[model samples]
Target chain A: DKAYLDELVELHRRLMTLRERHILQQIVNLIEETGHFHITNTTFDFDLCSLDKTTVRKLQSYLETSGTS
Target chain B: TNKLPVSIPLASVVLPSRAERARST
Candidate 1:
């Protein structure tokens, strides 16, 4: 229903930062659980690269830097 | 690209919340 959609999008806007942080946390959590992680421009492609998950998280930490204001 | 940023959509993705989503991700 429209009511639920409205609630969701509004929550989405307000919680963008927290949401991003959560996603970054997932990657970080994975790396911590394992030893490392990978991100890619394409999945299952030859261009995959090993990532320093912490650094990625740091970058993600500032994801809303310029866009929010 | 979060396909959505700055905010996580509880419903649809790409709801202009990509930056926030990226940070959270």
Candidate 2:
């Protein structure tokens, strides 16, 4: 019955988590930082190696557009 | 907005470890 619904939700959550991690890694590679960084969004918070203000703005725009579409 | 493309290694993508994935569930 509702077991499939629960599984669906779990699968969706895992997919979203993976996408978020993928996006964060892309950001890290874009910034080329050696240490670490941190970002907080409405849905989740995560850390990265490092980042800059310019890169942050770019990524902010990137996330907004990508997430919306 | 138009921008030039940037490239990164496909292998750089991150993923949760088995323990981390288990704990998340």
Candidate 3:
């Protein structure tokens, strides 16, 4: 429904930071569960590289600003 | 049941209410 889609996008904008933290938390939770975890590019096709998950996610969100405010 | 300690429980997963979800992980 249009109602739910619009609502979701709106929250996406306001909670961009909080949502980002949540994504980071997932990684955190995983790492905590295990001794260590592997980091990767957005495509999950690289290793021993620079950049981070949040930065990558932030960039992806910023780049795809279709319904974002 | 499922409720966030922050203002609204949804804010924990939805409905933002100014909670710091960051943890440098």
Candidate 4:
């Protein structure tokens, strides 16, 4: 039973990681689609304010370049 | 326009899988 529980825990952790990745991808897609950096008021559950400064700047840079094309 | 550099390590974390199941619906 201990081994089974350990496996379950591992699976749960993986699921959480995948879910976060999925969400981040979605956020990027939305930013690219809108050609805008700020999406705090959008229907999405996430906000740029939650991310660190460096990450937020990187994403903003992505937006500025990606939108120019 | 010159291409700006995005953080590759960050992209690796979030940009790996495309919208496989998310956009198909």
Clashing pairs in 2: A36-A49, A36-A50, A37-A48, A37-A49
* lDDT head-to-head 2 vs 3, winner: 2
Instruction: Give the local distance difference test score of model 4.
Output: 0.40
Tens-digit lDDT string for candidate 1 (B1-25): 1122231233332212244423434
TM-score of each: 0.22, 0.30, 0.22, 0.26
Model 1 chain A weakest lDDT span, ten residues long: A42-51
| Candidate 2 residue lDDT tens string, A1-69 | 655344334433443454555565755545434323232331222322123455545645545544434
Stretches > 4 Å off in candidate 1 = A19-69, B1-25
Model 3 per-residue lDDT tens digits across residues A1-69? 545344334433443444444443443333223323332332111111122444435433543456536
Query: lDDT by residue for model 1 over A1-69, one digit each (tens)?
Result: 545344335434554434454444443344333434333332211101233445444433443355555
Q: Give model 4's docking category.
A: incorrect
In TM-score terms, candidate 1 sits at 0.22
The true-versus-predicted C-alpha distance at residue A33 of model 1, in Å, is: 16
The lDDT-based order of candidates, best leading, equals 2, 4, 1, 3
Q: After superposition, how far is residue A59 of candidate 2 from its true place, in Å?
A: 1.9
Candidate 2, position B13, lDDT: 58
Better of 1 and 3 by lDDT: 1
lDDT of 4 at B25: 25
Across A1-69, the per-residue lDDT of candidate 4 in tens digits comes to: 455344334433443344445445654664445433322322322333333445554544442333335
- Residue A42 alpha-carbon offset, candidate 2, angstroms: 28
